[PDB]
Structure formats: C-alpha cells, structure tokens
Amino acid sequence: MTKIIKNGTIVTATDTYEAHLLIKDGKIAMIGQNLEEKGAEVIDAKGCYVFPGGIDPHTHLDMPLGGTVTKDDFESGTIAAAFGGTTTIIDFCLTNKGEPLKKAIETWHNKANGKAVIDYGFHLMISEITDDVLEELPKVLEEEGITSLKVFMAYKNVFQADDGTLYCTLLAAKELGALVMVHAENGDVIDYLTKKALADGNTDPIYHALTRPPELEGEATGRACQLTELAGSQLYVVHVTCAQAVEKIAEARNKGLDVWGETCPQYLVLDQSYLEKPNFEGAKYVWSPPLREKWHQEVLWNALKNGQLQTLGSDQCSFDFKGQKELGRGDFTKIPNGGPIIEDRVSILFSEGVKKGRITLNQFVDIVSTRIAKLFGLFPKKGTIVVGSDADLVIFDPNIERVISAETHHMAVDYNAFEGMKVTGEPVSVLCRGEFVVRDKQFVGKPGYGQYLKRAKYGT
Amino acid sequence: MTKIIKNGTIVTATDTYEAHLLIKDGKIAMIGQNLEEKGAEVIDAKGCYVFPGGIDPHTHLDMPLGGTVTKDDFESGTIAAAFGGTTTIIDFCLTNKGEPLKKAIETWHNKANGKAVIDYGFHLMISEITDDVLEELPKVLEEEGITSLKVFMAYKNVFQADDGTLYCTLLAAKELGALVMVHAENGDVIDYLTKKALADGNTDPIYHALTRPPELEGEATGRACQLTELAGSQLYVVHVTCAQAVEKIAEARNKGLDVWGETCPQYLVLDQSYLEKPNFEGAKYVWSPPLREKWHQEVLWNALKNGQLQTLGSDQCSFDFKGQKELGRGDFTKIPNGGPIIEDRVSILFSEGVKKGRITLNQFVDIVSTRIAKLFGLFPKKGTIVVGSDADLVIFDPNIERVISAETHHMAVDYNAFEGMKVTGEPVSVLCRGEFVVRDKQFVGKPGYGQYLKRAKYGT
Amino acid sequence: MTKIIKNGTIVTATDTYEAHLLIKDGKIAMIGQNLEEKGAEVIDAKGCYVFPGGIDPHTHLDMPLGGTVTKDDFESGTIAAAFGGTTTIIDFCLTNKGEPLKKAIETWHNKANGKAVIDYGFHLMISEITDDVLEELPKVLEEEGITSLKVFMAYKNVFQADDGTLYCTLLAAKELGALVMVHAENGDVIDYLTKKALADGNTDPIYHALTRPPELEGEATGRACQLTELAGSQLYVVHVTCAQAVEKIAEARNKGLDVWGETCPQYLVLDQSYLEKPNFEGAKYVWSPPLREKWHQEVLWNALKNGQLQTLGSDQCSFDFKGQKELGRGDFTKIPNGGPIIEDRVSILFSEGVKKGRITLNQFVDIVSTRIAKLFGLFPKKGTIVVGSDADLVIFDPNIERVISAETHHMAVDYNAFEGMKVTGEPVSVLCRGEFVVRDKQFVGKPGYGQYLKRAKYGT
Amino acid sequence: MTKIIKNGTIVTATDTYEAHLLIKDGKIAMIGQNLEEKGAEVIDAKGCYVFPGGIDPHTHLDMPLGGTVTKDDFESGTIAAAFGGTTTIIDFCLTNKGEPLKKAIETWHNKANGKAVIDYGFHLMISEITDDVLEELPKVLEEEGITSLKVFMAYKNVFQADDGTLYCTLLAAKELGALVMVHAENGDVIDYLTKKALADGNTDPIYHALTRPPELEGEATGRACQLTELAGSQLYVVHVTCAQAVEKIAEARNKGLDVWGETCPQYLVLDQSYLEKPNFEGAKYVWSPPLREKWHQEVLWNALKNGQLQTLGSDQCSFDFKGQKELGRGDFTKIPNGGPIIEDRVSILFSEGVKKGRITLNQFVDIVSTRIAKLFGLFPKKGTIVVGSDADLVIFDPNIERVISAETHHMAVDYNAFEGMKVTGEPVSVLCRGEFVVRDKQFVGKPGYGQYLKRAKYGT
Ligand SMILES: [Zn+2]
Ligand SMILES: [Zn+2]
Ligand SMILES: [Zn+2]
Ligand SMILES: [Zn+2]
Ligand SMILES: [Zn+2]
Ligand SMILES: [Zn+2]
Ligand SMILES: [Zn+2]
Ligand SMILES: [Zn+2]
C-alpha cells in the first residue's frame, strides 16, 4: 500500500535536501518534490528531518549474563530501538565450546523469531577454532548471512580466547570473507586485579572500573591490531572507551591496516564518577569496558569527528537495578555487566553531537546508520534513503527539547543510565520497510514483523 | 527543456542504485524508475554509471610561468576537463605584491569570461599580508565567492611567503571563514640545492627532482600543520607527493587538527625514473613537487584508501614539449613546471583505483567530486546526484579499454604524460547543469556556457 | 700476592689511558705509571688493552632442555667464558610451580658449587605468584643476592606466564627492589603456528623461525613495556632480535619508562638463512627468538650505537649437534633450543663492533661489562678498572686476526655457531680477582675458585 | 709543585670510589689510597666528593646585546664559574656579515686574554656561508681549535639565518668535522607575534614569553633535525625548553640521527609565572627561549634521566636589573635577553637532580662535565678524573644546605634568578690544572691563569 512522506528535509550520510519520498514495495520507489499518486496515505513531515533508520550493530537482547537474563528480550528491545530511531539491529549470538555452531544459531533464531518489531541479524561468537568449526564457518556464511565473527579478549573462563584463537579467526575471516570483531581488554590482568581487589575488601561498584585500567584496553586493542596486521585481515574494535585504545586504532589505520573502531553513547556522555554515586547506585553504570575519566570523552569525540572512530553502537544489555544489578552487593564482580542503551543511542548523538558542534548532520547519519550498514553487509538494503533501498525511515524532530527518563523510556528496565539528561531532538515516526513501527510517538508495530537479515560477505 | 537519463547505475559518494534522473531547470528534479514525461529527449544510459560531474580544485589555465604561458587556456582546458568527466574547476588566481587583490581577481575573471565550457571558481593567491590586504579579504569573501586563499612555501622570489605570512593568513582565514591551501616544499633549501646543482653542471631534467628531496616536502608540510595548529584554523595541503608528507598530514588529523591532503594522478601512477628517460624527454615530466621513487605510490594509495588523503586534483599546467619545455635545455630550472593532466584525472583514478582494488566505486566519487565540493563550499550545488543539485552528470562506461594518447587527448598540448597508458573506463556523455557538453564522446558545448561560482564560507 | 700489570692501555666504559695497575687484595690497589714494588710478578701488557672482565648476564649452564641437558656445565662453561674474556656470569635459576623457590636456588648453588672458575650469580625464574612466593621473594633478596626475577612470555606449558603473573611480578619487583627480565615472544600464537606447521609436514629447522615471526616478538615486547608502565617498575628485555622489538623498547625509553634491552652476537652477526643451510645443519642455529632476516642486524647495531639497546648477552645454552640437536629430526619443535655462545661474545663485539666502526672502544666496554654490572647490582665490585674494584681484568690483543673454529673453542660442544668466522682481536690473559684464570692463551685456573655473588637491590 | 687530595670520594661519569689523587704536572699523576710523597701540600677532602671540574658549553661573557654589554665580562664570569664548580667554559664568539671570521675570533681572544681565571674555548657564530667563509672554516679548525659552529634560527635581522645557510653549514660541518649548534626558535613567526603584541599595547615582560609559544621551539627544532638528517651531519640543540622540542630531539635520536640536546637550570627549576611577578620584576627572567609552564620541567628531567637530553649549559648572559634590564620598560622586546646563571649551574643540578632522585651521582658528572668534554673535543684533557687528564677538580660538600642569594653570588650582576632558593651541596675547593682557583670557599686565582683551548675535530 503506497505511501508518500512529503515536506521533509532528507538527510543521508552525504546529502541534505528537501523532497518527498514515494514508498512502494516497502522500498523507496522515487524521490522528488510535489509528488502525487491517488491512494498514498500521504504523510506530512514539515519541519522534520528524514533519516535512514538507525542500525545498532551492538546488541545483547535475550542474552544470559549469570543465573539471570537481560530484562529486555528481543520483543521489548526491538520496540525500544524502534522508538529510538533504530530500525535494524545485529545481536551477538553466543557460542559454547565443543557444541556445534548451528546449534547456537538456531537458539538465537528462536529468541528473535516472531518477536522482532524491526529487522535484525546476528554476529557469531567464537571461543575456539576446531576442525569442526572450520567446517561450519563457510556454511555459516552462505546459509545464514552471518559474515561477522566476534572475539572476547577479556572475560577469562567465560568468553575469552587466546591470541592463537584470535589469530586463526582473523585468517579464517580473511579467507572466508568475514569481519572479525573484538572486545579488547586484557582479561588475564583484569583477572588478577579483580581477585586482589576482592581479597582486600574493595567490593563497591567503582572497583569494577579501577580493577580494569584503560592501559589494559589499549594494550588489548594493540594486540588485536598487530595480529590483524600479521594475518592481513580486517578488524572491528567494539566499544572503544579510552584514549589509549583510540590511539592504537589510529596507528593501525595510518598503516593502511583495515581496522575499525566503534563507541557507545555511555562512553561519550557518562564517566567514571557515576560508579561512585553512592549507596549502590553505582551498579547502574557497571558494564565493560568501564566508564573512564571525563577527559577521554574529548578524545572520543575528536576520533569521531576526524574518523579514527567510525560507528556508534549501544552495547545494549539491560538488567533491573532492583533484582538483577543487586546480585552483586558485597561483590562488584557479581553485578551483571550491561546498560539499557538501545533506545537513546541515536538521539544522544544527534543532541550531544550534531546539535552541539561535534559531528555533522551528515556525519551523524553516517556514524549511526550508513557506515555500519556498509561494514556489515547491509548496504544499500539498509543504511540510506535512496531509490531501491528498504523504506527504513525516521521522521525526526530536531527541536523538541526533553529529558531522558526511565519514566518515559520504552525499555523493560527499571532505570535509564541517562536519567534526567536533557536532550534536543526526538523521533516522531519510525517506519521499517514502508510500514510504520512508531507513528506520532506512539507504537503501532507488531512483534514478528521484523525479519532476519542474511548479510553480505564483507563485499558488495 | 526537460531531459531523462534512464537505465543507468547511479553512483554517488554513498549510494549505488539503478534509477532514472528527471532533469528540469538544469537541476535534478526527481529520481526514480520508469520515469516518463512527454517531451524529455530521454537519454539512454544502459550499461553505464552516472557520476556527479568531477570537480578539479587544482587548475592553472591561462597562468603564465615564464616568458611563456600555459598552452591550454580557459577555453581548451575547459573542454579537456569536460571530456575527462570533470564539470567544475577551481583555478588559482595569482597575485602580485603591492598590487590590489581585486585587480588580479578581475584579470582572472577576464581569462575565464565567455570561454568556459563548464563552471568554475577561483582560489586567491597570497604572497603578503598588508593592511590593504586585510581590508579586501572580507570583501573578497562576500563579493566574489573566493573562500579559499592559497600560499607557496616554495618558489623563492616568485611566490614564496615566510611563515609569518603563512601564519597571519591562517588567522585571517580562521577569522574570515576561508580555507588556507599550501604548496608545501622548503623553498629556501630547494634554492641552495638548485644553485649548487647548476654550479656543478647538473642540468638535466632529473636534477629537478634530486634538487628537491621528499624530506623537504615533509618538512614544509609539517610547518604548515604545526602553524595551522597554533592558529587553530584549517589547512589543505595540495599535491601530497612523498610518504614523509602523508605522514605529517596523518599526525595532524590524528590530533584532531583540521588538516586536509590532496594528490594528483601523476604522483599516483608515474615516478622519478620518467625524468631520466632520455635525451630531453625528461622535461615532459617536470613539475613540482617532483615525481618520487615508485615506492611512495603505495603510501599514497593507502592514504587515499584509509583517509589520510581525501581529494584528487590534476595540478593542470600545460606546456608544449616543443617550444615551451625546451626553454630549459642546458638548465632544468628553466623548464616550465607543469603537466597536461586536467583531462585524464578522473579516468585514471577509476581505472587504477576502483577497477584494480584500491578505492571503492563510492570512494572514487568522493575523492574526485563530493569531498571536494564540500571542502570548497560548492555542495550540494555541485558534487552529488540528488534532487535539487545542479545536473552536472557524467555517463561513464566502466568497461571500455583504451590507451591514453596525445593523439587522442583534447588538451592543446603536443604531448600527454600518460602516453601509451592502458586505461579501463571512459566518459561517454558529460553534461553540466542539464545541458550536454560532451555527448557520445563528441563535443557539443559552447565556450561561455560555463559560469563563475561564488563559493560557501567553508560553511553550509 | 701482589701483582703489577704494566705498559697496557687501560680502557674503561669512559676512559682510555696508559698506566700500570697494582693489584693487591685481589682488588685494584692503585693506578699510575712506572709502578714498582719488590715482589709483584710484574706482568707486561705492552701493545694490549686492559678491559674490565666481561659480564655475561644471560647464561644457561647446567640447565636441562628436554630429556637432555646442556653439553656445557658450570665447569666447562666457566672456563669457556674465561677464555672469551668474560669473568662473571649470571645464570638463570629455573623454577617449578608449587615447589618452594629456595629449593631451586639450592639446586643451582649445587650445579655451580666448586666448579666455577670465575664468579657468578643467579636470576630467579618465576612461573607463578603464590602467597608462598610473595613470602620468599623478600628473603630471596636479602639472603641470596638474587635481585633480578625473570619471566617467559613464550614457551607455553613449559615456562610461560600470563600477563597477570607478569604484572604482579612487576609490582612485587618495584616494591622489593628487583629488576624484571622478560623473554618477549607471544607464546600462544607461536603455539598454534607451531602445531599447524607440523600438521602440514613442515618440520625442517627453518620452520622454527617461520613458526615465530618478529611481529610476535614486537607484540610481546610491547605488552611487557605497557605493563611495566602500568606497574611503574623496571623492565629488561632479554635477547632483542627484530626491529619491531627494538622499536617498542625505543618508545618505552622515550616515555621515560625504566626499560632496558639486551641482544646477543648471534642476532648481530648470523641470520635466518643459516637455518636453511642444508641437510640438518640448520638445527645448529635453532634457538629462540629465531634468527631474523639479515636486514634487522642494522637496526640492532644502530640501537646499540645510539642507546636503544644497552647490553650484550650470550644466551649460552649448548647442545651437541650430534646427539642433542638431532633429537628433533623429523620435528623441529624437538630440537633443543640454544647455541654455544658464552665464549665468543666479547670478541665478536670488539671485532664486528669496535674494529668496524660501530660502537666505540668505550661503548664496547660499557655494552659488555659496566652497563651490565650496574643494572644487576655488581658495580663497582665488577664492571670497571678502578681503585677498590675486584681485579677482574682482561689483557686483550686488538690486532691478532683469527678464525673462530670449534676446533679451537673451549666449550664442550661439538660445534661453534661462528665456525669459519674471521675475527680481529683476542684475549691473551684473563684474571679474576687478582688471580690468572687464563694466562697467555693457556688455562691456569681451578674449578671452585669462582665464588657466588649476592647482588645489589637495584640500588647502590 | 706536587699536591695530594686525600680522603675524598671520587665520582666520575662512571666510577664512585675512595682514593687519593696525586697531582703532578698540573695533571693527575696517579690514583690510589694512602698516597705519600715528601712535599705535596696534602689537601684533605674527608666527607667530600671530588668531581671533574664542570664544563659550561653555553657562555656569553663580554657579549653585547644592545647599546649595552653583559654585566659580567670574561674576568668576573670566570671567577663566578670557578666558585660554581665550573673550570672550563666555551663562549660564543659572534660574527658579522661580510666581515672576515678571523676578525671576530681575535676580538674574542682579546676579550678573554689575560682575564680568564680558568680555561676556555670558543664557538664560532655563522650568519652566512660565503666563498670567503668556506675558505676560512678549514683554517678556523686547524689554527684555532674552533670545531663547533653555531646558528640562530631566531632573532630575525640580528643573528637569524635561512635554512639554506643552516643546511650548507651542516654540510660544511660534516665535511670539515665540526658540530653544528642551533638556537631553535621560529624567528619569522616570533617576529610577527612580537610586532602585533606591541601593536596591541602588550608590553609587559610576560609577553616576551607569550610572544613565542613552545610550538615555535618545537617546530624550529624539527627543521634543524630534518635538515641535519638530509645533510647527514651532526646537530646540537642548545637550551631545549619545552616538551615539543624534547620530542623532536627524541625522534631524531631514535632514527639514529646524530642529534644532541642541552638544557639549562632556569628551564629545569623556574617557570613562566616568574615573568608576571610583578611591577617590572618580570624582566629579571627575560631570556630566550622563554620560561614555559611548570609542567614542562618534568619532561625535561625525564629527558635528562633517560638520555633524550644529555648536557646542561647555563646560557650565561648577565644584565643588571637596574640599568640594563630597565632599557625595556614600556617595551619588552627592548629588555636585554639573558640571565646570571654561570655560577649556580652545577650546584642546582646536584641539589635538584642528584639529591632529589632524578639523575645519578654519575649521571650528574656526565651531564655537567664529561659528556660535554666529549661532544666538544676536550676529552680527556678535561671532563674526567683519570691519570693523564688535567687536574681540573672540584672538592664538593654534598650536605651543606644554603640559600642562593645575590647577596652571596660572585657574579657582577645586581640580582640572581634563583634568589631565595634553598640548595643542598656546595663547592669548597675548585682547582684548574693542579692550581687552586678557589680554596675553602675563598678566591685564590689570578686573572690570566686561564688559557685558551684548541678543541678536537669532533674526533679523538
Ligand atoms: Zn563487550
Ligand atoms: Zn557487548
Ligand atoms: Zn604547486
Ligand atoms: Zn599547482
Ligand atoms: Zn629465552
Ligand atoms: Zn635464554
Ligand atoms: Zn640562545
Ligand atoms: Zn645563548
């Protein structure tokens, strides 16, 4: 059923113009001004921007971190993201050793199946390279568009992998045509620090941060790079936090190495102090890598501005401060890591970035949608507003001033890391593939509408 | 008179899709598929790409380098560029000390007046900062869209300016909203080297290169940067040649400094040896900075690939090998510097870059058009294929294999620096503002059709 | 019994003068010219240099690497070094997990006890940091002058330690006042490479080198540094081989970090090719890190010249090519790592370094004796020729040209890695604490004369 | 007349031991303990260190900076340095264009002739490279031991030289065997800044500093280096002040380039604030490069600690705050640059450096004496305490606590830049070539005793 979004200001990763969009088969049929066609529902976007739906490449929805599981599942999370201006997510499908990869992949397909309000895809976790694994990978690429393999350098005895596993993954990746993602923190050192902290009675939420200094993020990020170099493949460092890390990634890209960096709003806006703010409130901000000192934020922004860092992810991993977060009272190491971010990701960048001088209206769209779609083989189906691309759009209001509050967010968590934060700009209507998911700040989608996405081989 | 370019594959700096373009007021009216409108001339672009016309920010047309002047004037040069897929050029309007800036600006306007086949703009040369100059600059910005002021760090006693001049220019620029361009070569050292070379009988074309080692390009590029930092303004290093230079620019951009780098095909494809190839043929390749050792080419390409360098210019400055180039027989320093490049710029990057694995079809468009339009305030009038933008298009054939030959080029020079070079891809139809300038590899424009362009203040 | 070494040219790490040395209580009593004292044995050193005995901080004598043990034990090895101009060695006392440190320390004291011809000390290996270990360390410092604790980043499942162990060692070290030494190679990656090499039939000696690329040495050296920085202690990288490694150490020292680098002759003179030279001869050159490509040698020398690297060790670990080396025929990983170097260390540096333009006669003395004595708390007892210091001297002939041959060396190995090598300069008389150990190229010492050395706390 | 300094603790750049020195022909005859010889004056040094007299390579004594001349001439200055523990100075012999070099050299010889209390040498200033200059240089080396040529990159229209002059000097130097010294500050930029400062009424002493930002010192230092590289010669950057400069010099030495850095106490202890401290007092601290922000001091010390910087000079250039300094009341640019430092140089480094943890008792001697003697061809005549070397000694008391005060200093200036500064350690007896110049903190020398020094060709 044809639609026409008129009088809006279109803003792609490159262009900024005024025109109307004629949506047809759930795709953009044509762009121009004063469009008309009997029967079109004609949506009015006056005084609004029309962005390509956002893409969150860093999602953890039905993921289990402890005896508990994320408060937000694939259903709530999808809706949240939908309100936040995000219309496509790529969640991390976790893997267990010895167990066949297609096992996990189906487990995840079930988690998402019929509950997604918007489209999604997966990243495959890798904790070991077995002959059995090597045999599946190629299949995992063709059947199941999983073209991005992930690796934890931290989280000893839980996700961590030795450099040998990382290295062979990089090769396999280069060979098969996949992008290696990496959680760059020196697990082995963080481990001793963690143990000693506890051994000395330091259990408060803040020791979560002090127990893992930025030096260890930088160090890890470096190895990932050096190895990626040796292997001659491609790297994508997730959630770049400290300056040290930004630096390593900068050097890499200078050498022509195919390395990419990503960050998350929480690291751009919040900081280490929030972990001290008080009683047990700290736990609300416990996630890895830990929030750093306020000063790193600049470095991140500049990196974003000049290109050292090129994508923004949420690292969405919700846990009620109530039941969940409290699991680690007299033990910080027992606080489930993760924050409720999938919803305010886009907004915050526009507000803190665009609206304040950092980033450009175009850089914005690139950092939150396009660049990502490209790196993860979703372009041009996703990531842009052009004839042929899916009608994943966001009718955004750039002037509405508001305050982020858990009293308003649509995530199933009992709190919001950006509570009380004033923000300029807000999504008004968000549609995925020609169909509204959120019209006039009101939900109108249906769980199951979202469909899985097989992704390009890191090629066209 | 309405037109429709159908069945082409549209390729912007971001998008790559299939659709038709409905050209209206010399601008792009609308994009979509199966477009129709009685009376439209309907152009067929099957099996072709449709790029935003190229923009050459580095042009020297009616410029005089010696007792002689460039073989190509604004008329021939414009046509050449037109055939080469370039529809907008920004020539360097030279300045004389003590003489009022508006004097030169009009001299240039005359050189271009009624001879341009495509649109153009100017860069204002600066050899000194006088109170009189400071008074004109602001006017030079508002009246006359000249928002890019240029400086030579080399060419002692001819264009060169001390760091004080460079520094105050950077300030003035930051203040007024202009981009400072720089020819980064250590003129004072190159000078002694030059003199000594001659004093020892080394007069062949090759000593033009040996007389100015890449160390001096890097050194100069560094000062420009360090000073740009101190001043807190914006830099744009023209024709980056050696690795050393690329490096300095890389460091700058890492520090968040607002520095930009540009290169030219000749430095990407040719190399120092050509200056030895033989008799006097060397002089055909004499230009500054000099061609370096083959190995720097990689560095350049990687810089282009990863973003250290972001724009491609021609540095067009033609001289017949016959009369002109020969002016410096027993004296290389008397060979007029400059090469016939304005025509094959775009093609070479597509062929050597895109077609061979370096750059992307999108990076290509960015490096040759978009990125440039943006940095020099011509976006979105120029630099892209979108509703509202000027209909500056290029219907390109990506498969036609051919050989660059002066026997075929459309420049008024008796030779071509890329003679015999095999190239893949070629412009078939090039239109500026809805009107064909070159249809089916045949010229159909009219000198004077091209119009001057007032450019943005380094802002929207 | 008083002695007088006259007519020699004294060369310390700083001075170069002509005088006589009056040796008294096994120490240098006084320096001056035309010395006399009834009853003094008066040794004549005309046309000779008098260097402070060399100090080899990298020794593995009675060490066991496999079902076998080093061909040279503390007795032969001591004599060898004695002939080589080395009068003090610091061997690496290996440690086993769970087993008390003082156990090993005594095991070693036994290996050396009554067999040493010259003085010696120990380095304590660390494979784990236990509460039990933390309790002994302080004692290990006071009782037993062991002030240098060593860590293997490679040799997985044999010596290797995680970064946590390395990090806590660095702290303990900073706290206790010890120097952390490190074998910087990424064991986990070398491991997979090793396994795969075999899995593909690559078993020749050369795969020992290819199985462990310099990238992995640099990578490892980097971590060691970064961690040393975090901990704020002191590092000493043993056997720096590749450029990558030299670079990391250079960066560290630039940052003011207290990092030190050491190299060995074999890496300064031999290279990767020797591992291909032929049949099974390759095995003669198998040791870790592996010999690199000829070009790294320069980097090493420059590092040595300018100070990036400051000490020369042998990494003495002999194995008869016959029985021992052959243990790894169809399996390179089974070739015992180590080379017969303790004897030609000093000579080679003088010849290849001093005599050829690299290093200085003074730098020489510093790199082979003084600098080492200082870093390992043996100064000024050892490492110099000055009133009060032990009479550890070497009467060297700087002109004697000769050829290193196993047919002449005094090591118990059936071969010599520098066989056929022409060398200028040779030790004529070597005395430890006033007593000759080697007079006129003839052995005159007695096993047991050498005494253990308790070393300074990395202090005065 | 034979002398014996007994019971002292000898401290060279390498050694630290207890012995007696038998001084003979004004040189050190022999070292040992319990020395005796009828008729020797036997000096007692119990509880004292005995250092090799200090060497100040950065002196400006009878130099004229304006219509005025340094308050301290070669006589007073010599005595001052003598009290300060310095026994050898190398003053900068200034040069005028067009005027023959030997003219200036004799002018200087006159300034020093019969007024020096200790030994001295000269540096030859170079403001231009003429054929006439090229002819003298070689003579200037053989006749007149002037083997160090100096160049100002700042002080436009007064001492400044273009890069061409600097470059050819570097070559000449490499060729002839001289060391090029450089005052690294970007004169052309400092110039505009200076002019503008005045044009805006900023005339206070502090604008002397703000008028020349550290970016300009680093920039300049970089060129000197890059050029020194191109030329392949040797550089020696005088008075390294900011971090930026230290960095450039660090990079240089990393590349193996033969570059050296020097600093001065005032930059190690004082800082920018002193220029604001108040009324006109600021002028007391006006010298170039200007004092920087307190934080650079660390960088300097670390550079000194790790070796990025290797020598300490005074940059002595006294001017009575009264008449002289006041010449620039309403104009800072008219304040004669230079500070009264030749006397407390050594002491301050011992106190602030040695006594406080930075530097070593040995590093101390190296940084203030030895390293310098070596770089400027005075070793081993000067710079060490060894048989054969001149008896230039300093009997130092390491515990005497005191306060530096113009009320006590022996310089002819009406003030002291370190007034009120508490310092530990003080010279008790200073003798040059076996003769006391200062015995028991009391002057006993005679102007004229000091003799000129022809220096080595940057060789043995
Ligand atoms: Zn993570
Ligand atoms: Zn995550
Ligand atoms: Zn140019
Ligand atoms: Zn040009
Ligand atoms: Zn080892
Ligand atoms: Zn070893
Ligand atoms: Zn100076
Ligand atoms: Zn000076």
GROMACS .gro file of N, CA and C in nm, chain A residues 279-310:
model
   96
  279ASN      N    1   2.577   0.473   4.788
  279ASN     CA    2   2.491   0.363   4.829
  279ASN      C    3   2.526   0.245   4.738
  280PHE      N    4   2.442   0.217   4.639
  280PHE     CA    5   2.471   0.108   4.546
  280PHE      C    6   2.436   0.152   4.405
  281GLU      N    7   2.390   0.277   4.396
  281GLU     CA    8   2.352   0.336   4.268
  281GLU      C    9   2.459   0.312   4.162
  282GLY      N   10   2.584   0.300   4.206
  282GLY     CA   11   2.695   0.277   4.115
  282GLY      C   12   2.667   0.165   4.017
  283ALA      N   13   2.622   0.052   4.070
  283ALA     CA   14   2.592  -0.065   3.990
  283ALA      C   15   2.510  -0.036   3.865
  284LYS      N   16   2.437   0.076   3.864
  284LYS     CA   17   2.356   0.110   3.747
  284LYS      C   18   2.443   0.135   3.627
  285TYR      N   19   2.568   0.173   3.653
  285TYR     CA   20   2.664   0.206   3.549
  285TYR      C   21   2.774   0.103   3.526
  286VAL      N   22   2.757  -0.017   3.580
  286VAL     CA   23   2.856  -0.122   3.564
  286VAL      C   24   2.842  -0.198   3.432
  287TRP      N   25   2.944  -0.184   3.348
  287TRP     CA   26   2.950  -0.251   3.219
  287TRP      C   27   3.095  -0.248   3.175
  288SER      N   28   3.132  -0.333   3.081
  288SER     CA   29   3.271  -0.336   3.036
  288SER      C   30   3.288  -0.303   2.888
  289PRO      N   31   3.391  -0.224   2.853
  289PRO     CA   32   3.490  -0.165   2.944
  289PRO      C   33   3.422  -0.064   3.035
  290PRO      N   34   3.482  -0.037   3.151
  290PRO     CA   35   3.427   0.058   3.248
  290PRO      C   36   3.431   0.202   3.203
  291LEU      N   37   3.342   0.284   3.258
  291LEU     CA   38   3.343   0.426   3.225
  291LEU      C   39   3.480   0.480   3.269
  292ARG      N   40   3.538   0.569   3.189
  292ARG     CA   41   3.669   0.626   3.222
  292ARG      C   42   3.656   0.766   3.277
  293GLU      N   43   3.769   0.833   3.294
  293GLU     CA   44   3.768   0.969   3.345
  293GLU      C   45   3.715   1.063   3.238
  294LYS      N   46   3.630   1.156   3.281
  294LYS     CA   47   3.567   1.256   3.195
  294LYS      C   48   3.650   1.302   3.075
  295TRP      N   49   3.781   1.319   3.095
  295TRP     CA   50   3.868   1.367   2.987
  295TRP      C   51   3.882   1.285   2.860
  296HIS      N   52   3.856   1.155   2.867
  296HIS     CA   53   3.866   1.069   2.749
  296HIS      C   54   3.757   1.103   2.649
  297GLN      N   55   3.646   1.155   2.699
  297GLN     CA   56   3.532   1.189   2.615
  297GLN      C   57   3.570   1.276   2.497
  298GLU      N   58   3.659   1.370   2.521
  298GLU     CA   59   3.704   1.457   2.414
  298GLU      C   60   3.764   1.373   2.303
  299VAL      N   61   3.868   1.299   2.341
  299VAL     CA   62   3.939   1.213   2.251
  299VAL      C   63   3.841   1.133   2.169
  300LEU      N   64   3.740   1.078   2.234
  300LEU     CA   65   3.642   1.000   2.160
  300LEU      C   66   3.574   1.088   2.057
  301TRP      N   67   3.519   1.201   2.101
  301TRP     CA   68   3.453   1.291   2.007
  301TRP      C   69   3.542   1.329   1.888
  302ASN      N   70   3.667   1.367   1.915
  302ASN     CA   71   3.759   1.404   1.807
  302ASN      C   72   3.780   1.288   1.712
  303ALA      N   73   3.793   1.169   1.770
  303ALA     CA   74   3.814   1.048   1.692
  303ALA      C   75   3.696   1.033   1.599
  304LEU      N   76   3.578   1.060   1.654
  304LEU     CA   77   3.453   1.051   1.580
  304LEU      C   78   3.449   1.159   1.472
  305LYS      N   79   3.493   1.278   1.511
  305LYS     CA   80   3.497   1.392   1.421
  305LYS      C   81   3.590   1.370   1.303
  306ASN      N   82   3.715   1.334   1.332
  306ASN     CA   83   3.816   1.313   1.229
  306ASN      C   84   3.820   1.177   1.164
  307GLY      N   85   3.745   1.081   1.217
  307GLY     CA   86   3.744   0.949   1.156
  307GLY      C   87   3.822   0.834   1.219
  308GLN      N   88   3.890   0.856   1.331
  308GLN     CA   89   3.964   0.747   1.394
  308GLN      C   90   3.860   0.642   1.434
  309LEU      N   91   3.744   0.689   1.477
  309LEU     CA   92   3.634   0.600   1.515
  309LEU      C   93   3.526   0.628   1.412
  310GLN      N   94   3.459   0.524   1.365
  310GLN     CA   95   3.357   0.544   1.263
  310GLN      C   96   3.215   0.491   1.282
   0.00000   0.00000   0.00000
